[PDB]
């Protein structure tokens, strides 16, 4: 649905199907300017989404399951797997987070004698957990 938010009560300015009438697991926000979105359907099917006008230059998008952490790349109006990382059978991915973008203030943490340790700023990071039974090993 496309809905018009106004100071008055809204109006449903559009309803329509997606390209394939399939059940959807989630949606990941792609670029504001390019007006793209990525839809992950259950059955693990990924759909590029060109919604409306709203009236090399690679893009990388990355999604998680308990089976693994996968990573995905979009080029040429198509999605391709870029790599995979599944935990083994006994294992199970548990907890995940990405790097929220940050406006920058200080490139380094200082010391008493005006000395500086240069905190590590790499933007392309995520962190995650693995828990494995009988090992009793929370791996970070």
């Amino acid at each position: 649905l496309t809905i018009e938010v106004t100071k008055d009560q809204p109006i449903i300015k559009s309803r329509s199907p997606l390209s394939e009438r399939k059940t959807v697991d989630s949606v990941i926000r792609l670029n504001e300017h390019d007006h793209q979105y990525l839809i992950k359907f259950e059955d693990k099917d990924h759909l590029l989404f060109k919604l409306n006008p709203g009236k090399s230059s690679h893009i990388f998008v990355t999604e998680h399951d308990t089976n693994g952490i996968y990573g995905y790349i979009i080029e040429n109006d198509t999605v391709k797997q870029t790599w995979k990382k599944a935990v083994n059978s006994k294992e199970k991915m548990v907890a995940y987070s990405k790097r929220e973008t940050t406006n920058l203030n200080t490139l380094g943490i200082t010391l008493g004698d005006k000395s500086v340790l240069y905190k590590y700023l790499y933007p392309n990071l995520a962190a995650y957990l693995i828990a494995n039974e009988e090992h009793h090993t929370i791996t970070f």
Binding site: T82, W83, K84, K85, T139, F140
Partner: protein, 123 residues
């Protein structure tokens, strides 16, 4: 424990790239030996494939922009049981080849707490 490493085009085939072996010599120390590495022309963006017959098969574990003067440090990762857990690659300036290192998990602190004192019974 033999590993075979190969880049693939992901449409044509997995074209082989190298072969390595993993031996557990000491009580608790594994190590890698490069039985052979087969270098051919490499340039551009490629997806990697790693397979140890028996235990492990990571078909697409990484993706890098590769070059024929291979100058990478190949971190294979192990754990308390002497079993391969992961395979990944980083860039190190000094190798002019592929050299591989086995890695143990760099165990966490288990940071301290207050302890019971020593004969605070009659003292």
């Amino acid at each position: 424990d033999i590993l075979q490493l190969s880049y693939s085009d992901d449409a044509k085939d997995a074209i082989p790239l190298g072969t390595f072996e993993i031996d557990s010599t000491s009580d608790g120390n594994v190590t890698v030996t490069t039985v052979n590495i087969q270098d051919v022309e490499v340039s551009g963006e490629y997806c990697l494939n790693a397979q140890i017959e028996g235990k492990l098969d990571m078909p697409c574990f990484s993706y890098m922009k590769l070059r024929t003067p291979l100058k990478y440090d190949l971190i294979v990762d192990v754990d308390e049981d002497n079993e391969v857990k992961q395979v990944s690659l980083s860039y190190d300036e000094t190798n002019d080849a592929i050299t591989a290192t086995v890695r143990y998990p760099e165990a966490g602190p288990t940071a301290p707490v207050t302890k019971l004192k020593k004969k605070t019974k009659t003292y």
